[PDB]
Design a protein around this motif. Structure first.
Motif, mmCIF file in Angstrom:
data_model
loop_
_atom_site.group_PDB
_atom_site.id
_atom_site.type_symbol
_atom_site.label_atom_id
_atom_site.label_comp_id
_atom_site.label_asym_id
_atom_site.label_seq_id
_atom_site.Cartn_x
_atom_site.Cartn_y
_atom_site.Cartn_z
ATOM 1 N N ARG A 51 -84.292 -47.609 -68.869
ATOM 2 C CA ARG A 51 -83.669 -46.332 -68.557
ATOM 3 C C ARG A 51 -84.511 -45.148 -68.991
ATOM 4 O O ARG A 51 -84.234 -44.020 -68.576
ATOM 5 C CB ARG A 51 -82.295 -46.233 -69.221
ATOM 6 N N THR A 104 -80.511 -48.077 -80.893
ATOM 7 C CA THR A 104 -79.089 -48.355 -80.811
ATOM 8 C C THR A 104 -78.359 -47.042 -80.537
ATOM 9 O O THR A 104 -78.967 -46.035 -80.169
ATOM 10 C CB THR A 104 -78.605 -49.031 -82.094
ATOM 11 N N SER A 105 -77.043 -47.036 -80.703
ATOM 12 C CA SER A 105 -76.244 -45.824 -80.568
ATOM 13 C C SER A 105 -75.736 -45.433 -81.946
ATOM 14 O O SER A 105 -74.824 -46.074 -82.478
ATOM 15 C CB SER A 105 -75.082 -46.037 -79.606
ATOM 16 N N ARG A 106 -76.309 -44.380 -82.516
ATOM 17 C CA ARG A 106 -75.907 -43.881 -83.824
ATOM 18 C C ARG A 106 -74.494 -43.327 -83.757
ATOM 19 O O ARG A 106 -73.891 -43.301 -82.677
ATOM 20 C CB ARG A 106 -76.860 -42.787 -84.297
ATOM 21 N N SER A 110 -76.100 -40.040 -81.837
ATOM 22 C CA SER A 110 -76.897 -40.168 -80.628
ATOM 23 C C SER A 110 -76.440 -41.345 -79.776
ATOM 24 O O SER A 110 -75.823 -42.295 -80.257
ATOM 25 C CB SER A 110 -78.372 -40.321 -80.985
ATOM 26 N N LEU A 111 -76.770 -41.272 -78.491
ATOM 27 C CA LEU A 111 -76.398 -42.300 -77.531
ATOM 28 C C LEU A 111 -77.333 -43.497 -77.669
ATOM 29 O O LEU A 111 -78.042 -43.658 -78.666
ATOM 30 C CB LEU A 111 -76.424 -41.742 -76.112
ATOM 31 N N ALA A 112 -77.331 -44.364 -76.666
ATOM 32 C CA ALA A 112 -78.235 -45.499 -76.626
ATOM 33 C C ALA A 112 -79.475 -45.162 -75.808
ATOM 34 O O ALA A 112 -79.544 -44.142 -75.123
ATOM 35 C CB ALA A 112 -77.534 -46.724 -76.048
#
Length: 79
Positions: A55, A43-45, A48-50
């Motif tokens: 990707r 997920t996106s914390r 942090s990103l996703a």
RNA sequence: UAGAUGUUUAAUGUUAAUUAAUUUAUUAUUUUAAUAUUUAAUAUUUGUUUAUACAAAAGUAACUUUUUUUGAAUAUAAAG
């Protein structure tokens, strides 16, 4: 140096077929196999990103099209 | 010292009619369910190298945006 793409021109197959032969058959086709549960993406914390395993490993994506031509026959081929 | 010839607890104890020093006599050796040791300087772990096939049921700790068909709807990974 030996380049598969500059080689497939001698075999005429395609780019996305010579490669599927040189990585396991779950990174292209629809067989049974489990990748590793860290590659699954997160997920996106708050920090942090996703992530996503399309990707993160765009090369390891299942080529659902190339499975259409090789291993599964149509319904309009047997009418 | 101390009643007596020895096995059915003493209590207005911050009057369950109180409000600043109660400094509360209070605990079952074992059958309880939680923790803490001792075995324990431990047993077991320890990741530098092998030869690849496809289904289904099986899971779904799981994500997806990216090309399912030319069928409309539906579904495309993961154990026991």
């Amino acid at each position: 140096r030996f380049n598969l793409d500059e080689a497939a021109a001698e075999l005429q197959l395609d780019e996305a077929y010579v490669a599927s032969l040189y990585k396991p058959l779950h990174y292209t086709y629809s067989m049974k196999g489990q990748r590793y549960p860290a590659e699954q993406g997160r997920t996106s914390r708050p920090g942090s990103l996703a992530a996503s395993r399309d990707r993160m490993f765009p090369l390891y994506r299942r080529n659902y099209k190339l499975n259409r031509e090789l291993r599964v026959l149509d319904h309009r081929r047997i009418s």
